[PDB]
Amino acid sequence: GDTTITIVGNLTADPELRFTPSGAAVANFTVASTPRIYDRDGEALFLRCNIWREAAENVAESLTRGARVIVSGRLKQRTVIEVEVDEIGPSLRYATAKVNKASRSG
Amino acid sequence: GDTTITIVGNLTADPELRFTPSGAAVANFTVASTEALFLRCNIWREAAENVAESLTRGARVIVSGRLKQRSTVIEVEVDEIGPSLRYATAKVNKASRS
Amino acid sequence: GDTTITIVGNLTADPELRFTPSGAAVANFTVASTEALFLRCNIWREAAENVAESLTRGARVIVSGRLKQRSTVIEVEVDEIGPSLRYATAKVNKASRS
Amino acid sequence: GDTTITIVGNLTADPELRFTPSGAAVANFTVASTPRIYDRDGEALFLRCNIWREAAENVAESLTRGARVIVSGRLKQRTVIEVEVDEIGPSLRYATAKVNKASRSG
């Protein structure tokens, strides 16, 4: 099946979490990927992404508009094309970040 | 072409940073994915710093890069790297281009 | 970067070749992978010719390329393309660089 | 699991088919991938590949030394690294090819 894709770019805007008929969360956001040109950054590819499970609660509590991210997903369709994120992460090319999750909250 | 790879695994060690006479930084760390694939990775410039600055042993990471060679074995010429937000959360940011 | 893709599917039609005022060729064909993903693909220069020359409807193909945009939707800027030797055999060749 | 990889390059030499303790065929061959540089083709990455099932009988009856190919596989290990080809095909960037397989032989 595969037809997987890795996309690196910035978030067009703060994620948008959804919870539809099943009580399930869907972190929506579109990744904007800029290329590289040369004649003497140019134009961008905007990719509407979807991320589920509690992988979306983090993708919400962690990422925000303008955030550069690395997205590993799969290309699905139904007239548009969207990536069903399997993995998402804040690219440390131009930033830092504290991590982990196992204890705390109550 | 420039044959590329993407590894989603766990860091075996803590990014080991160093600086080249070029004034350029370079961090090394091997990503271990799960039947066990151990890929050593390299990262240059500021990215090197950011990695050491915020990454540690057994941390979930998504890595995109390019395979390389010579000595032989294949290592990774990481382009982008970051924490995996699968089983964890993490806030970020920096900025200032050129 | 230049975000890349690899599609393993079946050609819906027969590569449709054309020539640009630039004297350059260009073949179009949509690759349909299996819950059905339909990716339109583009191929330029000699490659265009070779494709039309040897590919036809519902043929198993491995395609590596780059996603693009504008009009919108995403199409594929194929780099390499060839018959899939999974459920079939096929002999080849050409040559002469520059 | 994934850690899949697509590699495009020429075959270092005619494939080498194996049939080991199970009566199973293993089409072995190593893909040589050349890069692109510029200062004013450079150096190659050699990737030992493995391909099974009857996907190897074709990979044997079809490809030969110098053949440019597109390989979709997975990176496995056990001190070396080898790609376990899921898909293989003759790149039509610089060549042509007749196809299909369903009737004939006896």
Curated annotation (Swiss-Prot), chains B, C:
GO biological process: one example: DNA replication
Protein name, entry field: Single-stranded DNA-binding protein
Keyword terms: DNA-binding
Positions of disulphide bridges: none
Keyword DNA-binding applies: yes
Self-association and partners: Homotetramer.
Keyword DNA-binding: yes
Domain SSB: 1-85
Single GO molecular function: single-stranded DNA binding
Coiled coil: none
CC terms in the record's Gene Ontology section: nucleoid
